[PDB]
Write a protein that holds these residues in place. Structure first.
Motif, PDB file in Angstrom:
ATOM      1  N   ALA A 144       0.752  -1.242  -0.004  1.00 51.99           N
ATOM      2  CA  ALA A 144      -0.068  -0.029   0.016  1.00 51.99           C
ATOM      3  C   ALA A 144       1.030   1.285  -0.100  1.00 51.99           C
ATOM      4  CB  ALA A 144      -1.030   0.059   1.139  1.00 51.99           C
ATOM      5  N   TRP A 145       2.117   1.264   0.504  1.00 56.07           N
ATOM      6  CA  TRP A 145       2.903   2.250   0.757  1.00 56.07           C
ATOM      7  C   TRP A 145       3.075   3.454  -0.417  1.00 56.07           C
ATOM      8  CZ3 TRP A 145       7.157   3.550  -2.040  1.00 56.07           C
ATOM      9  CH2 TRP A 145       7.896   2.495  -2.648  1.00 56.07           C
ATOM     10  N   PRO A 146       3.227   2.933  -1.847  1.00 52.80           N
ATOM     11  CA  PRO A 146       3.153   3.882  -2.761  1.00 52.80           C
ATOM     12  C   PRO A 146       1.981   4.745  -3.009  1.00 52.80           C
ATOM     13  CG  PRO A 146       3.992   1.641  -3.707  1.00 52.80           C
ATOM     14  CD  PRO A 146       3.155   1.616  -2.264  1.00 52.80           C
ATOM     15  N   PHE A 147       0.821   4.384  -2.217  1.00 49.48           N
ATOM     16  CA  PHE A 147      -0.402   5.240  -2.296  1.00 49.48           C
ATOM     17  C   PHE A 147      -0.568   5.983  -1.145  1.00 49.48           C
ATOM     18  CE2 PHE A 147      -0.419   1.144  -4.755  1.00 49.48           C
ATOM     19  CZ  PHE A 147      -0.675   1.507  -5.886  1.00 49.48           C
ATOM     20  N   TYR A 158       4.886  13.038 -15.347  1.00 45.12           N
ATOM     21  CA  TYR A 158       3.993  12.581 -14.737  1.00 45.12           C
ATOM     22  C   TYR A 158       2.602  13.414 -14.860  1.00 45.12           C
ATOM     23  CZ  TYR A 158       1.220  10.410 -11.010  1.00 45.12           C
ATOM     24  OH  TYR A 158       0.013   9.678 -10.538  1.00 45.12           O
ATOM     25  N   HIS A 159       2.822  14.772 -14.884  1.00 47.34           N
ATOM     26  CA  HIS A 159       1.454  15.988 -14.594  1.00 47.34           C
ATOM     27  C   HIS A 159       1.159  16.120 -16.108  1.00 47.34           C
ATOM     28  CE1 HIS A 159       1.216  15.953 -10.532  1.00 47.34           C
ATOM     29  NE2 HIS A 159       2.604  16.154 -10.347  1.00 47.34           N
ATOM     30  N   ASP A 160       1.763  15.587 -17.150  1.00 52.10           N
ATOM     31  CA  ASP A 160       1.347  15.722 -18.371  1.00 52.10           C
ATOM     32  C   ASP A 160       0.372  14.675 -18.940  1.00 52.10           C
ATOM     33  OD1 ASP A 160       3.127  18.092 -19.742  1.00 52.10           O
ATOM     34  OD2 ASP A 160       4.724  16.859 -18.707  1.00 52.10           O
ATOM     35  N   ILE A 161       0.623  13.288 -18.166  1.00 50.91           N
ATOM     36  CA  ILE A 161      -0.149  12.238 -18.380  1.00 50.91           C
ATOM     37  C   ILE A 161      -1.313  12.070 -17.478  1.00 50.91           C
ATOM     38  CG2 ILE A 161       0.154   9.609 -18.458  1.00 50.91           C
ATOM     39  CD1 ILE A 161       3.182  10.135 -19.522  1.00 50.91           C
ATOM     40  N   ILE A 162      -1.079  12.638 -16.093  1.00 47.63           N
ATOM     41  CA  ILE A 162      -2.175  12.226 -15.351  1.00 47.63           C
ATOM     42  C   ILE A 162      -2.686  13.488 -14.813  1.00 47.63           C
ATOM     43  CG2 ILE A 162      -2.430  11.581 -12.826  1.00 47.63           C
ATOM     44  CD1 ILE A 162      -1.597   9.109 -14.797  1.00 47.63           C
ATOM     45  N   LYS A 163      -4.115  13.654 -15.310  1.00 43.23           N
ATOM     46  CA  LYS A 163      -4.846  14.956 -15.341  1.00 43.23           C
ATOM     47  C   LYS A 163      -5.117  15.154 -13.848  1.00 43.23           C
ATOM     48  CE  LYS A 163      -8.074  16.453 -18.315  1.00 43.23           C
ATOM     49  NZ  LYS A 163      -9.363  16.582 -19.327  1.00 43.23           N
ATOM     50  N   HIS A 164      -5.533  14.154 -12.916  1.00 44.87           N
ATOM     51  CA  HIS A 164      -6.160  14.023 -11.736  1.00 44.87           C
ATOM     52  C   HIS A 164      -5.684  12.970 -10.835  1.00 44.87           C
ATOM     53  CE1 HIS A 164      -9.630  16.393 -13.434  1.00 44.87           C
ATOM     54  NE2 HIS A 164      -9.649  15.433 -14.448  1.00 44.87           N
ATOM     55  N   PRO A 165      -4.456  13.702 -10.262  1.00 44.61           N
ATOM     56  CA  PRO A 165      -3.772  12.896  -9.267  1.00 44.61           C
ATOM     57  C   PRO A 165      -4.732  12.529  -8.064  1.00 44.61           C
ATOM     58  CG  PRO A 165      -2.472  14.888  -9.751  1.00 44.61           C
ATOM     59  CD  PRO A 165      -3.954  14.955 -10.319  1.00 44.61           C
ATOM     60  N   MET A 166      -4.500  11.375  -7.394  1.00 45.44           N
ATOM     61  CA  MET A 166      -5.200  10.893  -6.098  1.00 45.44           C
ATOM     62  C   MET A 166      -4.526   9.939  -5.441  1.00 45.44           C
ATOM     63  SD  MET A 166      -7.970  11.303  -4.364  1.00 45.44           S
ATOM     64  CE  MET A 166      -8.322  12.867  -5.424  1.00 45.44           C
ATOM     65  N   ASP A 167      -4.649   9.989  -4.162  1.00 42.45           N
ATOM     66  CA  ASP A 167      -3.693   9.217  -3.156  1.00 42.45           C
ATOM     67  C   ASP A 167      -4.646   8.994  -2.016  1.00 42.45           C
ATOM     68  OD1 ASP A 167      -2.926  12.012  -2.405  1.00 42.45           O
ATOM     69  OD2 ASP A 167      -2.175  10.806  -0.724  1.00 42.45           O
ATOM     70  N   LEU A 168      -4.137   8.040  -1.001  1.00 45.57           N
ATOM     71  CA  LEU A 168      -4.830   7.857   0.058  1.00 45.57           C
ATOM     72  C   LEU A 168      -4.877   8.824   1.128  1.00 45.57           C
ATOM     73  CD1 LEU A 168      -4.087   3.969   0.472  1.00 45.57           C
ATOM     74  CD2 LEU A 168      -6.236   4.952  -0.294  1.00 45.57           C
ATOM     75  N   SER A 169      -3.822   9.687   1.318  1.00 40.24           N
ATOM     76  CA  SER A 169      -3.904  10.893   2.157  1.00 40.24           C
ATOM     77  C   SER A 169      -5.073  11.957   1.787  1.00 40.24           C
ATOM     78  CB  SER A 169      -2.527  11.550   2.361  1.00 40.24           C
ATOM     79  OG  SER A 169      -2.236  12.449   1.282  1.00 40.24           O
ATOM     80  N   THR A 170      -5.086  12.053   0.455  1.00 39.62           N
ATOM     81  CA  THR A 170      -6.379  12.670  -0.007  1.00 39.62           C
ATOM     82  C   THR A 170      -7.582  12.582  -0.013  1.00 39.62           C
ATOM     83  OG1 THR A 170      -4.922  13.942  -1.685  1.00 39.62           O
ATOM     84  CG2 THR A 170      -7.016  14.335  -2.400  1.00 39.62           C
ATOM     85  N   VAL A 171      -7.741  10.981  -0.061  1.00 39.32           N
ATOM     86  CA  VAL A 171      -9.119  10.234   0.201  1.00 39.32           C
ATOM     87  C   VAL A 171      -9.404  10.526   1.892  1.00 39.32           C
ATOM     88  CG1 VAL A 171     -10.235   8.234   0.109  1.00 39.32           C
ATOM     89  CG2 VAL A 171      -8.869   8.764  -1.824  1.00 39.32           C
ATOM     90  N   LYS A 172      -8.365  10.683   2.552  1.00 39.36           N
ATOM     91  CA  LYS A 172      -8.618  10.615   3.966  1.00 39.36           C
ATOM     92  C   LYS A 172      -9.013  12.098   4.236  1.00 39.36           C
ATOM     93  CE  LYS A 172      -6.267   9.786   8.608  1.00 39.36           C
ATOM     94  NZ  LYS A 172      -5.884  11.226   8.906  1.00 39.36           N
ATOM     95  N   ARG A 173      -8.225  12.931   3.664  1.00 38.48           N
ATOM     96  CA  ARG A 173      -8.796  14.265   4.119  1.00 38.48           C
ATOM     97  C   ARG A 173     -10.054  14.874   3.748  1.00 38.48           C
ATOM     98  NH1 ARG A 173      -9.449  18.700   0.940  1.00 38.48           N
ATOM     99  NH2 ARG A 173      -8.435  17.876  -0.951  1.00 38.48           N
ATOM    100  N   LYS A 174     -10.519  14.203   2.385  1.00 39.78           N
ATOM    101  CA  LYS A 174     -12.022  14.318   1.916  1.00 39.78           C
ATOM    102  C   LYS A 174     -13.061  13.593   2.667  1.00 39.78           C
ATOM    103  CE  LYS A 174     -12.495  14.549  -2.575  1.00 39.78           C
ATOM    104  NZ  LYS A 174     -12.587  14.202  -4.165  1.00 39.78           N
ATOM    105  N   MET A 175     -12.647  12.545   3.349  1.00 41.97           N
ATOM    106  CA  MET A 175     -13.515  11.749   4.266  1.00 41.97           C
ATOM    107  C   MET A 175     -13.565  12.590   5.594  1.00 41.97           C
ATOM    108  SD  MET A 175     -15.538   8.987   4.667  1.00 41.97           S
ATOM    109  CE  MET A 175     -15.034   8.162   3.387  1.00 41.97           C
ATOM    110  N   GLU A 176     -12.621  13.080   6.110  1.00 34.47           N
ATOM    111  CA  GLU A 176     -12.656  13.655   7.322  1.00 34.47           C
ATOM    112  C   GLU A 176     -13.374  14.983   7.185  1.00 34.47           C
ATOM    113  OE1 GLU A 176      -8.398  14.002   8.171  1.00 34.47           O
ATOM    114  OE2 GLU A 176      -8.270  12.295   9.037  1.00 34.47           O
ATOM    115  N   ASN A 177     -12.910  15.802   6.142  1.00 33.20           N
ATOM    116  CA  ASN A 177     -14.055  16.879   5.871  1.00 33.20           C
ATOM    117  C   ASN A 177     -15.233  16.808   5.235  1.00 33.20           C
ATOM    118  OD1 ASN A 177     -11.418  18.133   6.017  1.00 33.20           O
ATOM    119  ND2 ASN A 177     -11.078  18.825   4.209  1.00 33.20           N
ATOM    120  N   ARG A 178     -15.829  15.382   5.263  1.00 39.55           N
ATOM    121  CA  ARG A 178     -17.079  15.269   4.824  1.00 39.55           C
ATOM    122  C   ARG A 178     -17.385  15.666   3.470  1.00 39.55           C
ATOM    123  NH1 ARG A 178     -20.630  17.408   9.893  1.00 39.55           N
ATOM    124  NH2 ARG A 178     -18.786  19.074   9.980  1.00 39.55           N
TER     125      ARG A 178
END
Length: 113
Positions: free
Chosen positions: A27-30, A44-64
């Protein structure tokens, strides 16, 4: 919907599991946003338009931020898709992504109705 809070508790449970020591070997790369500069991934940012990772998912969960389970699952799957898009399919990171996605999909498919 009345079920949305209960379903989001199931999502939060999955998220906690994905971040748990149980799955850390793959899991660590995520855990954190891809630092493209740091890794020399200057495309990377030329290929990936919408970066996402578990810390961002967690922030979004915590923030409702997530209003339903579907929205949460879309972000977790986006994270895996970015890995599959950017990396050759034989790279170890892709094997790690598939393992963590297997953890995700099997438990997501147990969500209470």
């Amino acid at each position: 919907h009345m079920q949305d809070p209960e379903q989001l508790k199931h999502c939060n449970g999955i998220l906690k599991e994905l971040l748990s020591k149980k799955h850390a070997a793959y899991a660590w790369p995520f855990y954190k946003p891809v630092d493209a500069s740091a890794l020399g991934l200057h495309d990377y940012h030329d290929i990936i338009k919408h970066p996402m990772d578990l810390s961002t998912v967690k922030r979004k969960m915590e923030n409702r931020d997530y209003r339903d389970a579907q929205e949460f699952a879309a972000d977790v799957r986006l994270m895996f898709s970015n890995c599959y898009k950017y990396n050759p399919p034989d790279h170890d990171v892709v094997a790690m992504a598939r393992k963590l996605q297997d953890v995700f999909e099997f438990r997501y498919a147990k969500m209470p109705d």
